[PDB]
Amino acid sequence: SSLQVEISDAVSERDKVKFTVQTKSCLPHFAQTEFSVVRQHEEFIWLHDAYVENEEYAGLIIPPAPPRPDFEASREKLQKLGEGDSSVTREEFAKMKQELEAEYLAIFKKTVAMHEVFLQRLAAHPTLRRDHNFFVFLEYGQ
């Protein structure tokens, strides 16, 4: 009956954000008791919209969908950091690198938390935790 879900790590790519979703569970439906999948932001939204649209869940409250993380400004700094070379000293590069990492770290902390909380709210809900789409979201693509 147990279901525990969390996000262990994430990667921001040029155009995409991926979250690694970890599940520990004793529920017999799953192939394994501990497993992982990778999920882009989009798929959290698909799962949320599918809950909201499903008439079987009338009378239930669906946890709010996580916002789309915004790395746009940071990606352009990251691209420039690779390119700039031109007369940038090693000391300047190291400092630019250090501040950009801090910039990404904060964005990551917040978006991972909001994505994770969404899933944990689903896993705690006595009805929503049994949704078929949720099982697909947690397990598909081993």
Binding site: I7, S8, D9, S12, R14, S74, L81, Y104, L105, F108
Partner: peptide, 20 residues
């Protein structure tokens, strides 16, 4: 391409980013 990896810190270690 250029990417940033994020690893959540497992108690008590700190969260980490890696520029790649």
């Amino acid at each position: 391409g250029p990417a940033v990896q994020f690893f959540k810190g497992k108690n008590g270690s700190a969260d980490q980013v890696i520029l790649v």
